[PDB]
Amino acid sequence: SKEYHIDEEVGFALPNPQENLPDFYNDWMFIAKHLPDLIESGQLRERVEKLNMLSIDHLTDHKSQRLARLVLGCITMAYVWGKGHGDVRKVLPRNIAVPYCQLSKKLELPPILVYADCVLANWKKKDPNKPLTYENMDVLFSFRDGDCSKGFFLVSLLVEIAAASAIKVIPTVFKAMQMQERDTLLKALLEIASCLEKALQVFHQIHDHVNPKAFFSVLRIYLSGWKGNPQLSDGLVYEGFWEDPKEFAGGSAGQSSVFQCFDVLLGIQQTAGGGHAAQFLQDMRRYMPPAHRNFLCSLESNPSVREFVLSKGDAGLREAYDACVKALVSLRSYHLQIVTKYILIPASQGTDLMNFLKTVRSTTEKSLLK
């Protein structure tokens, strides 16, 4: 692990993310930092339009570029949707479009706000000597006041941090299988299940910080996109970069690499009963960071953990492997409960979504050995 950008402490999340772009981009930053004020007043769309075109050239390191994708990204979402009641912009101004697209090309993500932007790179610690807890963290950018962006973004991040405890054990799994050290392998699988159980309890926290009405009626809007959206049927026009409107999905609440990570480790094959499900999971990889998709691919290139357990007849190991599979099923199940609370109940003012989630979970539980 090194080419793949996975931190021992925070995993798929960006470690110690940059808070400030070069001053050359002060204009970008000003708008992104005032989205709450500037959206509520309707001054956002105007100011995005009075903006000069700045080169991406002074954004030299990875973090600077990731922060740009984040600021230019929020600005874009706020610009397209405005206050959220019909007045949509179908064309993004060149001066913000071309940099956003050029930066996206370099960083290999679609030009639309993505989970790697608004959750993984979107945090700082208040006090750096205190730990990584909600009471000691904060986000870099929010959209509108009372949008519960802090809660959703941070509680999501803290799950990613929790999951780092299980991801760090992955090399140990493979080393044990290579040097045929069966007890080290057994503790390893056992620690992964456990870390995933802590991961689950962390996910309980979402209720303490995210209000269902606020989420659905406010924040979900700036997270929403333009693939199959009746509001932007033909996509979005990135002025000056493509002449034709292009479609990209707004999927930030479903773009984490953590479930597919342990899909891949345990050799859970997500097509065994899945006409559409596999395509959808594979589309989600395209909205993950390139290193993170490279990682998942690299993982499948390792010798199968599952094949190894099934080829020993060791009851302790099967029991341990199942513990991990059970843990992934508990995450995906709790997750469903969250979608029911934060999407289904509020949408009562969809079911083809639920079955997709349900399909993905069942093949997972079906991948058990006992």
List binding-site positions for heme b.
335
CA distance to 71, 92, 175, 178, 323, per residue, from 337 (Å): 31, 36, 37, 39, 21
Tell me the window of 169-177, 179-187, 226-234, 257-265 that interacts with ligand HEM (CB under 6 A).
257-265
How many degrees, rounded to 5, is the angle at CA 27 between CA 21 and CA 29? 45
Cβ of residue 331: shortest distance to ligand HEM, in angstroms?
8
Tell me the window of 77-85, 105-113, 236-244, 251-259 that interacts with ligand HEM (CB under 6 A).
251-259
Residue selected from 68, 116, 159, 196 as contacting ligand HEM according to rule CB under 6 A: 159
Helices (H), 82-181: 94-107, 115, 149-167, 170-178
CB nearer ligand HEM, residue 216 or residue 241: 216
Q: Is 69 near ligand HEM (CB under 6 A)?
A: no
Residue selected from 310, 343, 344, 354 as contacting ligand HEM according to rule CB under 6 A: 343
Q: Is 253 near ligand HEM (CB under 6 A)?
A: yes
Residue selected from 177, 293, 342, 363 as contacting ligand HEM according to rule CB under 6 A: 342
Strand pairing class (237-238; 137-139): unpaired
Distance CA 159, CA 120 (A): 11
Cβ of residue 184: shortest distance to ligand HEM, in angstroms?
28
Distance CA 278, CA 270 (A): 6
Residue selected from 141, 259, 262, 321 as contacting ligand HEM according to rule CB under 6 A: 259
Nearest to 263 by CA among 206, 329, 343: 329
Cβ of residue 202: shortest distance to ligand HEM, in angstroms?
9
Residue selected from 339, 344, 354, 368 as contacting ligand HEM according to rule CB under 6 A: 339
- Binding residues for ligand HEM (CB under 6 A): 152, 156, 159-160, 203, 206, 210, 215, 251, 253-254, 256, 258-260, 284, 332, 335, 338-339, 342-343, 353, 360
